[PDB]
Design a protein around this ligand. Structure first.
Ligand code: 1GC
Ligand code: MG
Ligand code: MG
Ligand code: NA
Length: 325
DNA sequence: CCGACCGCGCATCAGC
DNA sequence: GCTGATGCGC
DNA sequence: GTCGG
């Protein structure tokens, strides 16, 4: 972390803008700047130097000059000292509680973990589970446990139908030594962009995983996306493993490459890549890459590899391990 | 200067 | 109920 | 908050 100090600062500012100011573009501006600085291979010596980077403008440059000269940022010192901002920032740490709900809770006099616990009936289902596992969800997942989890999911999916393919993406596929959660891409020959020849495809998999007590709770669930909680089994006399977040995304089998590009991320990498696509006259989602007409997105382009997608927008291919922005 | 900023699934709500 | 908008999250 | 045109 050559510039850990600066990137932390920008990240703290990003979170402030998202959670407190509810300014989504400032939030992303800060994340963009943090990311570009995080990959810059020199220890930054000044704001002017940082300003040379795409995404770092005049304001951030000044903040970087303040931070290098003093080791802190007055703007942040004050924010940390503001009861309301501190409260809202904390509440948003609960899964299911965002900027709006957080601010609403604070108004109603609900602003601590203790408050939340005694006002459970004021929470929706997602929020209840978020609170339930508040502690566990901030723990990291060692890659070693991710491997065990991978083994379980893949074998259980196989048990439901040998035709399922399950791929663990997210930070895990990018080779991270630890992950915030597990992200599982699912495909089945019966679900393509052309038809759904079989119902309950995602359901049957969730069911099986619940049946074996791997999945423990559900945050949300539709036909193509599951968001919930899972837990590795422990051994006799062993303390239990923390509960873990798990996301499962069912994607049409014929759109696997756009799907896996999406789910592999990182989020900022996708954002940057999609932004570039627009500049090259394409739009990219998790299903397709389409050209943009003189006016509207056109018809989907043939894609037979992740690299094919990079080719269209004229980027040299980047391995998953190099997409951690 | 200033419009535009990546793209979308599920849960909830308002209005009809 | 439906549709569209918003919140929250990937 | 930043930036392309
Ligand atoms: N285009 C796009 N893709 C996204 C976004 N957010 C997530 N993805 C894609 C890319 C992302 O890789 C994948 C999973 O997102 P997470 O599981 O929440 C964060 P991960 O990268 O997995 O790292 P972890 O902190 O869990 O160790 O969804 C977004 O805002 N936009
Ligand atoms: Mg993840
Ligand atoms: Mg995830
Ligand atoms: Na939250």
């Amino acid at each position: 972390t050559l510039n850990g100090g600066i990137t932390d600062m920008l990240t703290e500012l990003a979170n402030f803008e998202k959670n407190v100011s509810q300014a989504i573009h400032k939030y992303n501006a800060y994340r963009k700047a943090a990311s570009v600085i995080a990959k810059y291979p020199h220890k930054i010596k000044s704001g002017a130097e940082a300003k040379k980077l795409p995404g770092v403008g005049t304001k951030i440059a000044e903040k970087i000059d303040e931070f290098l000269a003093t080791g802190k940022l007055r703007k942040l010192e004050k924010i940390r000292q503001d009861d309301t901002s501190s409260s809202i920032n904390f509440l948003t740490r609960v899964s299911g509680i965002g900027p709006s709900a957080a601010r609403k809770f604070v108004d109603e006099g609900i602003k601590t973990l203790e408050d939340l616990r005694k006002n459970e009936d004021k929470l929706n289902h997602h929020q209840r589970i978020g609170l339930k596992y508040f502690g566990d969800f901030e723990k990291r997942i060692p890659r070693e446990e991710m491997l065990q989890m991978q083994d379980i999911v893949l074998n259980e999916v196989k048990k439901v139908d040998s035709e399922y393919i399950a791929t663990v993406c997210g930070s895990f596929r990018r080779g991270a030594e630890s992950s915030g959660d597990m992200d599982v891409l699912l495909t089945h020959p019966s679900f393509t962009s052309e038809s759904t020849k079989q119902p309950k495809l995602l359901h049957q998999v969730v069911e099986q995983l619940q049946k074996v007590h791997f999945i423990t709770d559900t945050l949300s669930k539709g036909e193509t996306k599951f968001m919930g909680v899972c837990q590795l089994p422990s051994k006799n006399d062993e303390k239990e493993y923390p509960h873990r977040r798990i996301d499962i995304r069912l994607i049409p089998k014929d759109q696997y490459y756009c799907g896996v590009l999406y789910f592999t991320g990182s989020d900022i990498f996708n954002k940057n890549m999609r932004a570039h696509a627009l500049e090259k006259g394409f739009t990219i989602n998790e299903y397709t890459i389409r050209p943009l007409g003189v006016t509207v997105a056109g018809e989907p382009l043939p894609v037979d590899s992740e690299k094919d997608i990079f080719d269209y927008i004229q980027w040299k291919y980047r391995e998953p391990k190099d997409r951690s922005e």
